[PDB]
Amino acid sequence: NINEILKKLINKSDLEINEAEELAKAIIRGEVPEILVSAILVALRMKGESKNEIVGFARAMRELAIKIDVPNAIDTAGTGGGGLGTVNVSTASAILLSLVNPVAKHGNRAVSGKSGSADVLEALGYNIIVPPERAKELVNKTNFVFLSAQYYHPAMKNVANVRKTLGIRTIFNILGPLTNPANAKYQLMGVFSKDHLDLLSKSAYELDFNKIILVYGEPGIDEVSPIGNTFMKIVSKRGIEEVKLNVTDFGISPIPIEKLIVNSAEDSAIKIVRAFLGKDEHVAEFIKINTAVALFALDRVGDFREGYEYADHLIEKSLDKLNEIISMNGDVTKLKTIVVKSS
Amino acid sequence: MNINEILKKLINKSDLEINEAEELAKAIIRGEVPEILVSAILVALRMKGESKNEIVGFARAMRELAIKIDVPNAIDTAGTGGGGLGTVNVSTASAILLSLVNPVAKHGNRAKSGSADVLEALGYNIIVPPERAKELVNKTNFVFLSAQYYHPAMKNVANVRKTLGIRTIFNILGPLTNPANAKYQLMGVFSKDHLDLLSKSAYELDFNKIILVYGEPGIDEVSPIGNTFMKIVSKRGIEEVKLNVTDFGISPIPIEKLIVNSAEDSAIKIVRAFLGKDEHVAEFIKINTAVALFALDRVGDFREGYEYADHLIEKSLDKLNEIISMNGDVTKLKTIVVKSS
Numbered sequence: 266n267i268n269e270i271l272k273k274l275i276n277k278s279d280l281e282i283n284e285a286e287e288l289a290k291a292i293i294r295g296e297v298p299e300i301l302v303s304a305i306l307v308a309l310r311m312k313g314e315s316k317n318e319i320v321g322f323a324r325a326m327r328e329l330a331i332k333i334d335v336p337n338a339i340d341t342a343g344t345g346g347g348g349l350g351t352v353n354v355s356t357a358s359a360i361l362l363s364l365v366n367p368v369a370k371h372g373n374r375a376v377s378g379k380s381g382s383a384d385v386l387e388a389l390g391y392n393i394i395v396p397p398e399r400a401k402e403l404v405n406k407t408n409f410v411f412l413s414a415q416y417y418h419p420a421m422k423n424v425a426n427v428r429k430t431l432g433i434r435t436i437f438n439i440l441g442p443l444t445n446p447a448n449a450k451y452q453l454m455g456v457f458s459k460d461h462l463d464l465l466s467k468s469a470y471e472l473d474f475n476k477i478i479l480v481y482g483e484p485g486i487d488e489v490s491p492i493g494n495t496f497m498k499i500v501s502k503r504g505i506e507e508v509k510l511n512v513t514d515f516g517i518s519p520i521p522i523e524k525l526i527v528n529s530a531e532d533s534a535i536k537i538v539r540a541f542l543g544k545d546e547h548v549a550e551f552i553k554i555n556t557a558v559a560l561f562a563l564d565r566v567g568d569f570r571e572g573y574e575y576a577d578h579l580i581e582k583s584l585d586k587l588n589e590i591i592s593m594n595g596d597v598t599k600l601k602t603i604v605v606k607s608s
Numbered sequence: 609m610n611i612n613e614i615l616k617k618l619i620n621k622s623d624l625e626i627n628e629a630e631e632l633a634k635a636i637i638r639g640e641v642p643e644i645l646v647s648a649i650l651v652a653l654r655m656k657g658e659s660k661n662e663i664v665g666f667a668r669a670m671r672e673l674a675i676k677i678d679v680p681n682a683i684d685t686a687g688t689g690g691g692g693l694g695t696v697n698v699s700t701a702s703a704i705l706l707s708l709v710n711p712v713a714k715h716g717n718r719a720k721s722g723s724a725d726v727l728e729a730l731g732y733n734i735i736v737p738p739e740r741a742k743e744l745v746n747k748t749n750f751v752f753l754s755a756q757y758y759h760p761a762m763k764n765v766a767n768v769r770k771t772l773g774i775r776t777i778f779n780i781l782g783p784l785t786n787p788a789n790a791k792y793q794l795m796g797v798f799s800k801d802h803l804d805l806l807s808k809s810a811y812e813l814d815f816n817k818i819i820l821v822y823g824e825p826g827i828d829e830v831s832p833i834g835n836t837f838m839k840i841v842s843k844r845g846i847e848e849v850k851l852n853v854t855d856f857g858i859s860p861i862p863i864e865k866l867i868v869n870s871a872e873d874s875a876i877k878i879v880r881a882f883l884g885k886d887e888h889v890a891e892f893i894k895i896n897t898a899v900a901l902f903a904l905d906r907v908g909d910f911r912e913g914y915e916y917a918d919h920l921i922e923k924s925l926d927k928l929n930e931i932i933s934m935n936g937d938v939t940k941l942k943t944i945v946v947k948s949s
């Protein structure tokens with residue numbers, strides 16, 4: 266009952282998992298008036314969301330999602346929220362990872378005029394209209410697929426207006442990487458705030474991954490830090506392992522954030538492609554350190570340095586892989602224009 | 609400050625200044641803010657816990673946008689509601705006694721029996737425009753000032769309030785926002801916890817004497833069964849007072865006798881009490897009146913107030929009759945009196 270839940274939230278009592286899941290389902294289904302949805306989303310944030318509430322909302326979104334089944338896939342995706350406007354590094358990293366493992370990403374086009382994963386993929390020529398059966402086929406043939414939230418999380422449209430009108434960030438903004446509709450059992454999860462590492466790692470531990478690594482990077486980004494320390498949690502059935510890593514532990518000097526910042530999807534696309542051509546080493550290094558940790562989550566390397574070395578071999582083959590991905594699901598002529606502009 | 613910065617502020621648990629809260633209330637009450645954002649703000653205020661400055665600013669905002677008549681020498685006896693007990697409309701009954709000895713300016717909305725509802729069952733015309741309102745106070749020493757007429761801007765938040773279905777800041781401001789600006793006030797509060805908070809707010813809201821009262825077991829009235837905690841507020845400051853029901857020279861009143869299931873049932877119980885046919889309802893009315901009398905400095909103490917309330921209650925049905933005949937339908941009152949006899 267929406268009314269007692271709200272009173273409970275107002276009193277700063279944490280919800281149980283099933284309480285939270287039913288709450289999320291009613292909201293996502295559009296069964297709850299906008300006024301009460303706004304009330305609930307604000308109350309959750311001001312109370313401070315608990316593990317049980319994160320797990321419940323995650324399971325609700327997964328259950329209401331349109332699904333495919335690629336449990337052996339990896340995803341590398343973040344919560345967003347840092348807003349530094351840096352290159353779409355997880356998208357580039359997915360391309361390296363697809364050479365050696367199935368990859369399934371998901372998400373939305375960004376608001377204008379930001380650059381999300383969907384937008385950089387589209388600038389590269391990718392067709393984000395991918396029905397489930399096609400998605401299955403695409404992953405089999407090319408080890409990569411992008412699953413648009415519009416199609417795979419279609420019920421999220423029912424909370425869109427409250428979310429937009431509120432402006433502020435809510436529980437929904439930290440659920441993205443925990444709600445992969447391909448059921449990817451391996452996950453590199455970026456989190457924008459150091460204070461959310463603990464909540465989300467503990468939540469992740471009950472969301473049934475084989476291995477999920479949560480990363481927060483200085484100066485405040487949902488990625489492996491190119492400037493300094495990365496604070497990470499390694500979650501498995503064995504438990505949660507604390508890890509602190511500096512960029513120097515990859516064998517490289519700190520990358521200046523200036524070099525990673527982008528001003529459009531195309532610019533992000535150009536940066537990525539130049540890194541694949543060996544013409545932008547700062548972005549390549551950023552891509553590679555993020556891939557290195559993803560490789561570690563897959564249990565393909567024994568440490569992060571080896572992952573970084575191994576990513577170097579993958580980046581050299583990535584433009585060719587990008588071409589095969591886009592030729593199978595997209596317009597190769599858009600990739601070639603980006604390549605010309607990258608040369 | 610625009611609305612989105614205000615919400616940011618409230619989500620970060622920063623208290624608003626009086627003037628900020630007042631300008632925030634005005635925007636909300638004028639209908640300038642989307643319902644989703646009004647919902648968010650009211651919830652954040654409650655999550656944060658509203659401060660004195662916020663209470664004062666919101667109240668002043670309502671006062672500003674109210675339609676005003678001038679009757680400060682009037683007394684009001686009114687509560688915030690809440691607590692879950694569906695009791696007889698005791699402050700409205702008390703108003704009828706008090707109108708014998710002082711002008712009374714009641715105000716509020718329909719609820720399932722609020723003050724407006726009982727009055728209408730008795731036959732009162734609850735919509736009284738300003739000019740004739742002052743007229744009826746002059747003539748009968750009593751008027752009810754409907755929030756629908758006198759707080760029209762509040763129509764802009766009625767939906768959000770009802771849809772939220774939880775108490776908000778607006779639910780503690782009713783007795784602080786009389787459109788006639790009565791300088792003497794008995795203010796009911798349903799929780800001990802807000803007594804200090806509301807009394808400190810009231811102290812900055814320019815009453816000559818406002819008495820705030822919380823009654824066990826958890827109602828916005830003088831306690832019929834036990835202890836009443838109260839704050840006497842004036843220019844002199846805030847005075848603490850503890851008062852058992854035995855201090856009125858009576859025993860505990862069985863709570864069940866005070867509970868009501870319709871507006872007509874509240875009306876019958878009140879009339880019966882005036883006829884001397886429901887002594888428990890009578891006692892409930894009288895202990896609350898006693899405290900009103902004390903606010904008006906009509907009595908030296910609450911025992912004296914109670915005793916004098918008994919004199920007043922014997923004239924109250926005839927007073928009720930003159931009030932309703934001057935503004936409403938007496939044939940409804942008589943139908944109730946027949947149900948009561």
Ligand SMILES: O=P(O)(O)OC[C@H]1O[C@H](OP(=O)(O)OP(=O)(O)O)[C@H](O)[C@@H]1O
Binds near residue numbers: 345346352357374438
């Ligand atoms: O704002 P939202 O739509 O909720 O999305 C949150 C973030 O998730 C995506 O990152 P992802 O890690 O998937 O890709 P990227 O690192 O390549 O941008 C995205 O591009 C945003 O940065």
Ligand SMILES: O=P(O)(O)OC[C@H]1O[C@H](OP(=O)(O)OP(=O)(O)O)[C@H](O)[C@@H]1O
Binds near residue numbers: 688699701
């Ligand atoms: O729910 P709301 O509309 O905001 O009203 C709150 C209370 O204010 C009125 O009491 P009042 O003290 O004026 O009369 P009573 O104590 O005689 O009922 C009313 O009947 C409610 O109990």
Ligand SMILES: [Mn+2]
Binds near residue numbers: 354355455488
């Ligand atoms: Mn990312």
Ligand SMILES: [Mn+2]
Binds near residue numbers: 343351488
């Ligand atoms: Mn990022």
Ligand SMILES: [Mn+2]
Binds near residue numbers: 686700796828
């Ligand atoms: Mn009352």
Ligand SMILES: [Mn+2]
Binds near residue numbers: 796
């Ligand atoms: Mn009451």
